[PDB]
Structures are given as C-alpha cells and as structure tokens.
Amino acid sequence: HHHHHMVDEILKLKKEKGYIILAHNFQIPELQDIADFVGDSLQLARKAMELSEKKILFLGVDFMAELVKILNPDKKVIVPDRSATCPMANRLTPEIIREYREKFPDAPVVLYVNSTSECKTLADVICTSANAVEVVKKLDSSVVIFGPDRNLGEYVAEKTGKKVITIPENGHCPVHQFNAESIDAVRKKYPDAKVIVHPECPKPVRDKADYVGSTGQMEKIPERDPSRIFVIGTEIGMIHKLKKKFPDREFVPLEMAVCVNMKKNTLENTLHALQTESFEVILPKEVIEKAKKPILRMFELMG
Ligand SMILES: O=C(O)C1=C(C(=O)O)N=CC(=S)C1
Numbered sequence: 001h002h003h004h005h006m007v008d009e010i011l012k013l014k015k016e017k018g019y020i021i022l023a024h025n026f027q028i029p030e031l032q033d034i035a036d037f038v039g040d041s042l043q044l045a046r047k048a049m050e051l052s053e054k055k056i057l058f059l060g061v062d063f064m065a066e067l068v069k070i071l072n073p074d075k076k077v078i079v080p081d082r083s084a085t086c087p088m089a090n091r092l093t094p095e096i097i098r099e100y101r102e103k104f105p106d107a108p109v110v111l112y113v114n115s116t117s118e119c120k121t122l123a124d125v126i127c128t129s130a131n132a133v134e135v136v137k138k139l140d141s142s143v144v145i146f147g148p149d150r151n152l153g154e155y156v157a158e159k160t161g162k163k164v165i166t167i168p169e170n171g172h173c174p175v176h177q178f179n180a181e182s183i184d185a186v187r188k189k190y191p192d193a194k195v196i197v198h199p200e201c202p203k204p205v206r207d208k209a210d211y212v213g214s215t216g217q218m219e220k221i222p223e224r225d226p227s228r229i230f231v232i233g234t235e236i237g238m239i240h241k242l243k244k245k246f247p248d249r250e251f252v253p254l255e256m257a258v259c260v261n262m263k264k265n266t267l268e269n270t271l272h273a274l275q276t277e278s279f280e281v282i283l284p285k286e287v288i289e290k291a292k293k294p295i296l297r298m299f300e301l302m303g
C-alpha cells in the first residue's frame with residue numbers, strides 16, 4: 001500500500017517535474033523498477049549524455065552521480081542521500097598520487113571509477129572494471145600506477161602482462177571478499193552452474209570461477225552461454241537485474257553481499273528528492289574541467 005503510494009507518487013512527480021531516473025545495478029529492486037535506466041556507471045554516464053532532458057535523479061553513490069555531472073555540466077543532477085559514497089575509495093588521496101608520480105614519472109596514473117572526483121583531476125586516465133584491461137592494454141607504457149583497488153589492479157596485470165603499481169597500500173572492496181569455499185560448496189550443490197565473479201574479488205575466488213567480469217559484463221554472459229544456472233559473486237542488486245533480463249534462467253548469489261552505501265537510497269528519500277528537488281550534485285567548475293580530461297581519454301582508448 002505505502003510502496004504503491006510511494007511508487008505512484010514518484011512516477012507522478014518524475015513526469016510532472018521533467019526528471020529522468022538513472023539507477024545503478026546495486027540499487028534495491030524497488031528503485032531499479034522505478035528507474036528509466038538501470039546500468040553500470042559507464043552505461044549510465046553515456047546514457048546521460050544522450051538525454052534531451054536537463055534533469056536527472058541519480059540512484060547510486062556520489063562518485064557515480066559526479067561522473068554523470070562532469071560529463072553533463074549543464075544538467076541538474078540530484079541524489080536522495082548526499083552521504084552515499086565509497087569509503088574505501090576515499091583512502092586514495094592527492095598526496096599518495098603525487099608521491100607515486102614522482103617515483104615512477106613514466107607510469108601513467110590509471111584511476112578506477114570509484115576514486116573521488118578530486119582524485120580524478122590528478123589521473124591520466126579513468127577506467128571501470130568493464131574496460132580496465134582494454135584501457136591499460138592500449139596505453140604506450142608497460143608500467144602503470146593503478147588505484148584505488150588492488151585486486152582489480154592485479155587482475156589487470158594478469159591479463160595485460162604489464163606492471164601495475166597499486167595505490168594505496170592494501171586498497172580492497174569488502175563487498176567482494178567472498179570465501180573461496182563458497183565456490184567449492186556451490187559446485188557440488190549445482191554441478192552444472194556457471195560461476196561468474198567480479199574482478200574486485202580476491203585471486204583465489206577469481207581463479208575458481210568460470211567467468212570474471214564486471215556487472216555490465218555479467219549481464220552479457222547469458223547472451224552467449226546457454227546454461228540454466230549462474231552463480232553470481234557480486235553485490236546482491238545484480239541478482240534482480242539479471243533475473244529481470246533473463247527470466248528463463250536461474251541466478252544464485254555466491255554469498256549475500258550488500259553495499260551499505262548503495263542501500264542508503266530508499267523509496268522514501270527518493271520521493272523526498274523529487275518533492276524538494278534536492279540534493280543537487282555540484283562540483284567546482286575547475287574540478288569538472290580537470291576531471292573531464294582523463295575521462296575523455298578513457299573513451300578515446302575504448303571507442
Ligand atoms: O562500473 C560500475 O558501475 C561499478 C561496478 C561494476 O561492476 O559495474 N562495480 C563496482 C563499482 S564501485 C562500480
């Protein structure tokens with residue numbers, strides 16, 4: 001009843017006030033369902049650039065909303081919880097980047113998308129887990145500085161054969177610290193299941209999986225693998241996304257993994273956001289201009 005009210009009022013206010021809702025794959029199912037588009041940060045950013053609308057309600061975490069805003073400076077971007085962020089990303093700082101640039105002056109600074117917008121202004125190129133391998137492959141260098149995620153950096157080193165110098169020391173994602181034993185357990189319980197895990201997972205988990213890929217990659221695997229059952233080693237939000245796309249197959253969480261910050265967004269605070277038209281994502285224009293360069297480098301090296 002209340003969700004029915006909240007859902008209908010959200011759909012009403014989004015229509016009335018000219019907002020497009022963009023939701024990340026890790027949002028709760030109820031917010032994914034009222035979104036105009038659901039996707040990874042790259043898909044959502046690219047999508048934003050194509051919109052005729054000048055108003056965006058973004059449903060994810062701050063670095064993502066800011067990625068949208070940097071590529072769409074003249075659109076009004078709001079979020080329902082202004083504290084939704086990536087705690088581990090904020091362990092990488094400007095001074096660590098400067099320090100490592102000095103020591104390895106010829107190593108391009110490749111920053112993972114979860115990095116703060118301030119940190120992005122000091123990068124040579126941005127990447128996501130979808131494109132990180134391709135991006136580091138096409139750089140001239142045989143050595144790269146990579147942060148903030150150490151597991152993704154080592155994965156990239158593995159697949160490119162390049163030297164990846166990770167920063168900071170011990171940057172990792174709690175959400176993807178799956179037990180390797182959990183894979184052994186599912187392979188006996190579901191013998192024919194395909195295990196897909198995120199490259200942020202530790203090396204023993206990746207190496208025992210049938211596929212390693214980001215959320216965008218995970219959702220393309222059933223387009224080419226006919227298996228009836230997939231075991232999914234990422235954040236719980238992707239199970240709903242996959243089930244919706246491929247109703248014919250079964251998706252089983254490797255374990256329950258919840259990103260607390262992603263779950264800060266609710267139907268209630270989303271409705272408040274459309275009522276009040278807050279909270280606006282504002283970056284100093286200087287940050288937009290400086291962060292935009294390594295982002296455009298990323299597309300140049302992708303496309
Ligand atoms: O690319 C994305 O949207 C992200 C993904 C993804 O796999 O799509 N995973 C983790 C983060 S922090 C962001």
Ligand SMILES: [Fe+3]
Nearest residue numbers: 085086087114
């Ligand atoms: Fe995070």
Ligand SMILES: [Fe+3]
Nearest residue numbers: 086114173175
């Ligand atoms: Fe993350």
Ligand SMILES: [Fe+3]
Nearest residue numbers: 173175176200
């Ligand atoms: Fe993560």
Ligand SMILES: [Fe+3]
Nearest residue numbers: 175259261262
């Ligand atoms: Fe997270």
Ligand SMILES: [S]
Nearest residue numbers: 061085086114
């Ligand atoms: S995150």
Ligand SMILES: [S]
Nearest residue numbers: 086088114173
């Ligand atoms: S992350």
Ligand SMILES: [S]
Nearest residue numbers: 173175235259
């Ligand atoms: S994440």
Ligand SMILES: [S]
Nearest residue numbers: 173175259260
């Ligand atoms: S997270």
